[PDB]
Paper text:
There are six human p21-activated kinases (PAKs) subdivided into two groups based on functional and sequence similarity. PAK1, PAK2 and PAK3 are the group A or group 1 PAKs, whereas PAK4, PAK5 and PAK6 are group B or group 2. PAKs act as effector proteins for the Rho GTPases CDC42 and Rac and transmit signals for the regulation of the cytoskeleton, growth, development, proliferation and survival. Group A PAKs have a GTPase-binding domain (GBD, also known as CDC42/Rac interactive binding (CRIB) domain) N-terminal to an auto-inhibitory domain (AID) and a serine/threonine protein kinase domain (KD) that is highly conserved.
ATP-γ-S is a commonly used ‘hydrolysis resistant’ ATP analogue, so we were surprised to discover that in the crystal structure ADP and magnesium ions were resolved at the nucleotide-binding pocket, while the thiophosphate group of ATP-γ-S had been transferred to the PAK3 activation loop. This is the first example of a crystal structure of any protein containing a thiophosphorylated residue; in spite of the common use of ATP-γ-S in co-crystallisation (over 130 entries in the PDB currently list ATP-γ-S as a ligand). PAK3 is in an active conformation, with thiophosphorylated activation loop at T436. The sulfur atom of the thiophospho-threonine is clearly resolved in the electron density and makes hydrogen-bonding interactions with K321 from the αC-helix of the kinase N-lobe and R401 and R434 of the activation loop, with maximum donor–acceptor distances in the region of 3.1–3.6 Å, compared with donor-acceptor distances of 2.7–3.0 Å for the phosphate oxygen atoms and their interaction partners. Thiophosphorylation of PAK3 was detectable after 1 min of incubation in solution and the protein was fully thiophosphorylated after 1 h. The interaction of the thiophosphorylated residue in PAK3 with the side chain of K321 in the αC-helix is unique to the PAK3 ADP-bound structure. In the PAK3 structure, the salt bridge linking K312 of the β3 strand (equivalent to K299 in PAK1) to E328 of the αC-helix, highly conserved in protein kinases, indicates that the kinase is an active conformation, whereas in the PAK1 structures, this interaction is disrupted by the K299R mutation. The overall fold of the thiophosphorylated PAK3 activation loop has high similarity to the phosphorylated PAK1 activation loop, with minor shift at the main chain around T415-S419 (PAK1 numbering) where crystal packing influences the conformation. The PAK3 FL SAXS envelope has a similar shape to that of PAK1 FL including the central bulge that fits the KD, and atomistic models generated for FL PAK3 using the PAK3 KD structure and the AID of PAK1 as a template closely matched the experimental SAXS data.
Residue numbers in the entry: 260 to 556
């Protein structure tokens, strides 16, 4: 419900002045998603290595949500949220400068290596802390999935990519926009119901399936087919559930409840006994290294 001009006016009011091509150098592309292309670069003045997300505003899936992105990343700082540094607007290109997490994304790990249950529990704990913080501040992320989870080389876990997020209010306490990535969407999203923060808990459940099986269900299917499969299959089935502990299977079942009221909240799932199996995050470091080497080769 915002025009292109209203969106650009709002973005201009919140970014810093200047052209960032004069402030950063030695760019190298490290990732790309539905909104932006992300580079490493060096701050010309200081030498710091940063990450820079470059977004072309007219090629955006929903233009006005980029406002929430900058606002949420800088107004809701937290140890499990990628650290915002700055933002710039050059006509129709928006840049967001943030800390660089050299371990890459959780996608790199789950597609190249096999996490054990203690490593999965550790990652789930960190993601649940982030979600409890966001949800308590009335932010729904709406795009939880492995490629939006960043890793430090020491195993630090940080949520990024707030470009689909919703800030919910008393007058609009639920959302109804079809937004997210189809394979990770909760059934109440795909069936076009009003929905709330627990859609992120479902998506976390699907990301935990990624940590087991390397990918979410139905990844090869056309998006509209996947949406119908989510609507009719309900709680997805694992290929080999007998390989997982009973306590881990219970955690998954509580993330992936069809009934929104039965589904765990972030605060509730932080008390789940599965998280007591967690290993130190430093245990991720050999998986991170092995994944980077495999991708390089
Ligand atoms: N700060 C960062 N450090 C390291 N890698 C990053 C960082 N930010 C993004 N990436 C990588 O770039 C990809 C795209 O970034 P993201 O912000 O998710 O863009 P989009 O909104 O287009 O999906 C991420 O999935 C991740 O692999
Ligand atoms: Mg992304
Ligand atoms: Mg995004």
């Amino acid at each position: 419900s915002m025009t292109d001009e209203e969106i650009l006016e709002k973005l201009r009011s919140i970014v810093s002045v200047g052209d960032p091509k004069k402030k950063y150098t030695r760019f190298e592309k490290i990732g790309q998603g539905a909104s932006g292309t992300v580079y490493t670069a060096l701050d010309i003045a200081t030498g710091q290595e940063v990450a820079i997300k470059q977004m072309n505003l007219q090629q955006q899936p929903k233009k006005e949500l980029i406002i929430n992105e900058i606002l949420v990343m800088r107004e809701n700082k937290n140890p499990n949220i990628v650290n915002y540094l700055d933002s710039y607007l050059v006509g129709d290109e928006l840049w967001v400068v943030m800390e660089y997490l050299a371990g890459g994304s959780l996608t790199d790990v789950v597609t190249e290596t096999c996490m054990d249950e203690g490593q999965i529990a550790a990652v789930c704990r960190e993601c649940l802390q982030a979600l409890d913080f966001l949800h308590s501040n009335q932010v729904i992320h709406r795009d939880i999935k492995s490629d939006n989870i960043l890793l430090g080389m020491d195993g630090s876990v940080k949520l990024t990519d707030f470009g689909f997020c919703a800030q919910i209010t008393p007058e609009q306490s639920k959302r109804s926009t079809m937004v997210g990535t189809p394979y990770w969407m909760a059934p109440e999203v795909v069936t076009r119901k009003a929905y709330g923060p627990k859609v992120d808990i479902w998506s976390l459940g699907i990301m935990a399936i990624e940590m087991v099986e390397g990918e979410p269900p139905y990844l090869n299917e056309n998006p509209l087919r996947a949406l119908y499969l989510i609507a009719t299959n309900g709680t997805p089935e694992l290929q080999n559930p007998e390989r997982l502990s009973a306590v881990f299977r219970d955690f998954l079942n509580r993330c992936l409840e069809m009934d929104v009221d039965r589904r765990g909240s972030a605060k509730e799932l932080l008390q789940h006994p599965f998280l007591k199996l967690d290993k130190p995050l430093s245990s991720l470091t050999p998986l991170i290294i092995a994944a980077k080497e495999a991708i390089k080769n």
